Scaffold this active site. Sequence first.
Site, PDB file in Angstrom:
ATOM      1  N   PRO A   1     -91.908 -31.776  30.111  1.00 47.59           N
ATOM      2  CA  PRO A   1     -92.406 -33.180  30.593  1.00 47.59           C
ATOM      3  C   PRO A   1     -93.565 -33.108  30.584  1.00 47.59           C
ATOM      4  O   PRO A   1     -94.793 -32.383  30.508  1.00 47.59           O
ATOM      5  CB  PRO A   1     -91.751 -32.388  32.238  1.00 47.59           C
ATOM      6  CG  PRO A   1     -91.634 -31.053  31.516  1.00 47.59           C
ATOM      7  CD  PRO A   1     -91.036 -30.572  30.479  1.00 47.59           C
ATOM      8  N   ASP A   2     -94.217 -34.433  31.312  1.00 42.42           N
ATOM      9  CA  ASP A   2     -95.557 -34.834  30.991  1.00 42.42           C
ATOM     10  C   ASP A   2     -95.883 -34.028  32.658  1.00 42.42           C
ATOM     11  O   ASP A   2     -94.945 -33.342  33.133  1.00 42.42           O
ATOM     12  CB  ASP A   2     -95.508 -36.086  31.216  1.00 42.42           C
ATOM     13  CG  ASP A   2     -95.120 -36.899  32.155  1.00 42.42           C
ATOM     14  OD1 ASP A   2     -94.570 -38.175  31.486  1.00 42.42           O
ATOM     15  OD2 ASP A   2     -95.168 -36.902  33.368  1.00 42.42           O
ATOM     16  N   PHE A   3     -96.751 -34.987  33.160  1.00 40.15           N
ATOM     17  CA  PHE A   3     -97.787 -34.117  34.443  1.00 40.15           C
ATOM     18  C   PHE A   3     -97.362 -34.448  35.841  1.00 40.15           C
ATOM     19  O   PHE A   3     -96.526 -34.201  36.911  1.00 40.15           O
ATOM     20  CB  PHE A   3     -98.630 -34.432  34.130  1.00 40.15           C
ATOM     21  CG  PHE A   3     -99.254 -32.375  33.972  1.00 40.15           C
ATOM     22  CD1 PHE A   3     -99.088 -32.778  32.857  1.00 40.15           C
ATOM     23  CD2 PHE A   3     -99.901 -31.950  34.731  1.00 40.15           C
ATOM     24  CE1 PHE A   3    -100.000 -31.048  32.283  1.00 40.15           C
ATOM     25  CE2 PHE A   3     -99.990 -30.781  34.559  1.00 40.15           C
ATOM     26  CZ  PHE A   3    -100.624 -29.751  33.382  1.00 40.15           C
ATOM     27  N   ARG A   4     -97.717 -36.535  35.463  1.00 37.83           N
ATOM     28  CA  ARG A   4     -96.945 -37.432  36.729  1.00 37.83           C
ATOM     29  C   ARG A   4     -95.997 -38.221  36.688  1.00 37.83           C
ATOM     30  O   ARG A   4     -96.183 -39.170  37.566  1.00 37.83           O
ATOM     31  CB  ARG A   4     -99.014 -37.910  36.638  1.00 37.83           C
ATOM     32  CG  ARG A   4     -99.753 -36.885  37.301  1.00 37.83           C
ATOM     33  CD  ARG A   4    -101.197 -37.210  36.867  1.00 37.83           C
ATOM     34  NE  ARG A   4    -102.275 -36.469  36.913  1.00 37.83           N
ATOM     35  CZ  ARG A   4    -103.233 -36.301  35.673  1.00 37.83           C
ATOM     36  NH1 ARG A   4    -102.455 -36.056  34.728  1.00 37.83           N
ATOM     37  NH2 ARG A   4    -103.483 -35.428  36.601  1.00 37.83           N
TER      38      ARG A   4
ATOM     39  N   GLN B   1    -105.666 -32.786  24.613  1.00 38.12           N
ATOM     40  CA  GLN B   1    -104.935 -32.204  26.176  1.00 38.12           C
ATOM     41  C   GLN B   1    -103.985 -31.354  26.309  1.00 38.12           C
ATOM     42  O   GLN B   1    -103.633 -31.036  26.941  1.00 38.12           O
ATOM     43  CB  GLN B   1    -105.289 -34.195  27.059  1.00 38.12           C
ATOM     44  CG  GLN B   1    -105.922 -34.960  26.745  1.00 38.12           C
ATOM     45  CD  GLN B   1    -105.466 -36.303  27.951  1.00 38.12           C
ATOM     46  OE1 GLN B   1    -105.452 -36.524  27.325  1.00 38.12           O
ATOM     47  NE2 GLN B   1    -106.316 -35.824  28.862  1.00 38.12           N
ATOM     48  N   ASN B   2    -102.494 -31.939  25.817  1.00 36.10           N
ATOM     49  CA  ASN B   2    -101.723 -30.365  25.365  1.00 36.10           C
ATOM     50  C   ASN B   2    -101.903 -29.091  24.962  1.00 36.10           C
ATOM     51  O   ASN B   2    -103.504 -29.526  24.074  1.00 36.10           O
ATOM     52  CB  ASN B   2    -100.088 -31.216  24.541  1.00 36.10           C
ATOM     53  CG  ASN B   2     -99.953 -32.278  24.759  1.00 36.10           C
ATOM     54  OD1 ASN B   2    -100.370 -32.730  25.976  1.00 36.10           O
ATOM     55  ND2 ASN B   2     -99.672 -32.974  24.122  1.00 36.10           N
TER      56      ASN B   2
ATOM     57  N   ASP C   1     -99.410 -26.934  24.274  1.00 39.02           N
ATOM     58  CA  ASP C   1     -98.319 -26.385  23.356  1.00 39.02           C
ATOM     59  C   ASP C   1     -98.459 -26.423  22.113  1.00 39.02           C
ATOM     60  O   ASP C   1     -97.432 -25.464  21.622  1.00 39.02           O
ATOM     61  CB  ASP C   1     -97.122 -27.254  23.803  1.00 39.02           C
ATOM     62  CG  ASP C   1     -97.487 -28.983  23.093  1.00 39.02           C
ATOM     63  OD1 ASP C   1     -98.370 -28.829  21.855  1.00 39.02           O
ATOM     64  OD2 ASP C   1     -97.085 -29.958  24.098  1.00 39.02           O
TER      65      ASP C   1
ATOM     66  N   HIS D   1    -108.187 -29.211  26.811  1.00 39.33           N
ATOM     67  CA  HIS D   1    -107.580 -27.925  27.097  1.00 39.33           C
ATOM     68  C   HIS D   1    -107.307 -26.948  27.134  1.00 39.33           C
ATOM     69  O   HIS D   1    -107.122 -26.165  27.709  1.00 39.33           O
ATOM     70  CB  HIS D   1    -106.690 -28.789  28.500  1.00 39.33           C
ATOM     71  CG  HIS D   1    -107.160 -29.796  28.389  1.00 39.33           C
ATOM     72  ND1 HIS D   1    -106.510 -31.473  29.039  1.00 39.33           N
ATOM     73  CD2 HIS D   1    -108.446 -30.565  28.861  1.00 39.33           C
ATOM     74  CE1 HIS D   1    -107.227 -32.160  29.563  1.00 39.33           C
ATOM     75  NE2 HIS D   1    -108.355 -31.714  29.965  1.00 39.33           N
TER      76      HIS D   1
ATOM     77  N   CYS E   1    -111.452 -11.910  31.490  1.00 33.22           N
ATOM     78  CA  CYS E   1    -111.732 -11.273  32.606  1.00 33.22           C
ATOM     79  C   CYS E   1    -112.150 -13.286  33.320  1.00 33.22           C
ATOM     80  O   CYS E   1    -113.315 -13.543  32.692  1.00 33.22           O
ATOM     81  CB  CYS E   1    -112.684 -10.310  32.120  1.00 33.22           C
ATOM     82  SG  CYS E   1    -112.155  -9.565  34.285  1.00 33.22           S
TER      83      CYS E   1
ATOM     84  N   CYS F   1    -116.592 -10.188  34.685  1.00 35.36           N
ATOM     85  CA  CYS F   1    -116.824 -10.136  33.226  1.00 35.36           C
ATOM     86  C   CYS F   1    -117.066 -11.272  32.268  1.00 35.36           C
ATOM     87  O   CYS F   1    -117.592 -10.795  30.784  1.00 35.36           O
ATOM     88  CB  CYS F   1    -116.591  -9.309  33.219  1.00 35.36           C
ATOM     89  SG  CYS F   1    -114.658  -8.289  32.087  1.00 35.36           S
TER      90      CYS F   1
ATOM     91  N   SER G   1    -102.443 -40.461  30.665  1.00 37.54           N
ATOM     92  CA  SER G   1    -102.718 -41.775  31.648  1.00 37.54           C
ATOM     93  C   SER G   1    -104.147 -41.876  31.960  1.00 37.54           C
ATOM     94  O   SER G   1    -105.145 -42.204  32.388  1.00 37.54           O
ATOM     95  CB  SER G   1    -102.431 -41.241  33.060  1.00 37.54           C
ATOM     96  OG  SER G   1    -102.623 -39.891  33.017  1.00 37.54           O
TER      97      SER G   1
ATOM     98  N   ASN H   1     -98.661 -46.107  24.740  1.00 38.98           N
ATOM     99  CA  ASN H   1     -97.562 -45.584  25.704  1.00 38.98           C
ATOM    100  C   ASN H   1     -97.023 -46.524  26.448  1.00 38.98           C
ATOM    101  O   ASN H   1     -96.760 -47.745  26.105  1.00 38.98           O
ATOM    102  CB  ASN H   1     -99.131 -45.261  26.939  1.00 38.98           C
ATOM    103  CG  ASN H   1     -99.087 -44.764  27.601  1.00 38.98           C
ATOM    104  OD1 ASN H   1     -99.228 -43.342  27.026  1.00 38.98           O
ATOM    105  ND2 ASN H   1     -99.723 -45.018  28.821  1.00 38.98           N
TER     106      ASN H   1
ATOM    107  N   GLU I   1     -96.856 -47.139  29.736  1.00 32.63           N
ATOM    108  CA  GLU I   1     -97.281 -48.306  31.191  1.00 32.63           C
ATOM    109  C   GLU I   1     -98.777 -48.326  30.559  1.00 32.63           C
ATOM    110  O   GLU I   1     -99.454 -47.062  30.007  1.00 32.63           O
ATOM    111  CB  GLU I   1     -97.587 -47.314  32.231  1.00 32.63           C
ATOM    112  CG  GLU I   1     -98.192 -45.643  32.332  1.00 32.63           C
ATOM    113  CD  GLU I   1     -97.867 -45.426  33.624  1.00 32.63           C
ATOM    114  OE1 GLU I   1     -97.089 -45.471  34.302  1.00 32.63           O
ATOM    115  OE2 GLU I   1     -98.891 -43.805  33.663  1.00 32.63           O
TER     116      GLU I   1
ATOM    117  N   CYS J   1     -93.239 -43.833  22.394  1.00 30.56           N
ATOM    118  CA  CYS J   1     -94.319 -43.548  21.772  1.00 30.56           C
ATOM    119  C   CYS J   1     -93.666 -43.028  20.039  1.00 30.56           C
ATOM    120  O   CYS J   1     -94.337 -43.550  19.399  1.00 30.56           O
ATOM    121  CB  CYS J   1     -95.291 -42.697  22.058  1.00 30.56           C
ATOM    122  SG  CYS J   1     -94.290 -40.853  22.763  1.00 30.56           S
TER     123      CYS J   1
END
Length: 272
Positions: free
Chosen positions: A31-34, A105-106, A108, A123, A131, A134, A202, A225, A227, A242
Site C-alpha cells: 500500500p501507499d501512504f496517503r 522514496q521506497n 521495499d 529514504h 544505534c 553511539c 504525492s 500519477n 492524481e 501507472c
Amino acid sequence: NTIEDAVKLLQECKKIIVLTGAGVSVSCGIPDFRSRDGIYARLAVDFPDLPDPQAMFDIEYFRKDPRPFFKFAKEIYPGQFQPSLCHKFIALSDKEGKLLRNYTQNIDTLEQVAGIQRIIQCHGSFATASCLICKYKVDCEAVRGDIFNQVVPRCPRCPADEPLAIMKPEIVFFGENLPEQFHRAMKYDKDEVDLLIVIGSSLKVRPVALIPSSIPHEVPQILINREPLPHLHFDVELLGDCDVIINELCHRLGGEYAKLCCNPVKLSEITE
Ligand SMILES: NC(=O)c1ccc[n+]([C@@H]2O[C@H](COP(=O)([O-])OP(=O)(O)OC[C@H]3O[C@@H](n4cnc5c(N)ncnc54)[C@H](O)[C@@H]3O)[C@@H](O)[C@H]2O)c1
Ligand SMILES: NC(=O)[C@H]1CCCCc2c1[nH]c1ccc(Cl)cc21
Ligand SMILES: [Zn+2]
C-alpha cells in the site's frame, strides 16, 4: 501535454531521472501512504494506541517508545514481493543506457529485484542498522532475528543501563537526515538531466519534493500519477494507473519496450 508528447520526449531524451514513490508498488501488493487504502488508514485501525499514524516512522516517538515499530517492521521488511511493470520499465531504460538515475522514496528494494543499477534509495533501507546513541553500524543479519520476533534489538557496544541503545534500521524517519549518497548524486545529476519523470508520488515530503524545482526549469517534466499534484507544474500530466500508462507507453515505443507489455488491470484478487 498529451501521451504522444511523452513518447516523443522518451524517444529524444538520453539522461532521464525517474523519481518514484509508493504508488509504483501498489500493484505488487504494497500500500501507499496517503490514499484511502494507504498505510495511515491501516495504522489507525491496527495501531490505535499511537498518537497519530505518522508516529510509526517519526524519530521523536521512536525515541520515546520503539516497541510499535518493531511490532510492525516485519510487515514492511523486503523480500516478499515481485517488481511491477513500472520497475521493469525503469530497468529496461537503464539497460538501454537512457537512465541517469532512479531516485526512489521506497524501502521495499524491488528496484534490486527488477535490476535497476543507477538507483538512489533516498529514504534508506533495512540493509543496515544503527544505534541511536553511539551510531554503531551493523548489517541487517545482526538484527534480522529480532525484527522477525518483534523484539527491540539492542546495541552491543552501549551498556545495558542505557534505554535508548536501540539498533534502528537505516530507513529515514521524520526528523532524520537522508543518506549522503542522495545529496552527492543530486549535486551531479541536476546539471546532466534532460528529462524528469515523477511516478506514483504525492511529493509532500522534503527534501525529495524539492527535486522538480532544483533542476533547470528548461528540462521537460512528466507526471505519471493517479492524481495531479496541485502545487507543481508539469509539461505532461499522464493521469491514471501507472502500470496502465507505462503499458501504453511501451506499446507506442515498440522494440524492447513492447516486450514488457502485459495486462496490468486484468481481474485478480490480492491475498494477505
Ligand atoms: N512518519 C511518517 O509518516 C513518514 C516517515 C518517513 C517517511 N514518510 C514518507 O512519506 C513519503 C512520501 O510518500 P509517497 O509519495 O511515496 O506516497 P504517497 O502515499 O504520499 O503518494 C503516492 C502517490 O501515488 C499515487 N498512486 C497510488 N497508487 C497508484 C497507481 N497504481 N498508479 C498511479 N499512481 C498511484 C497516489 O495517488 C499518490 O499521489 C514516503 O516515501 C515515506 O518515506 C512518512
Ligand atoms: N513501498 C515502500 O517501500 C513504501 C510504502 C510501504 C510502507 C513502508 C515505506 C515505504 N517508503 C518508506 C520510506 C520511509 C519509511 Cl521509514 C518507510 C517506508
Ligand atoms: Zn550503542
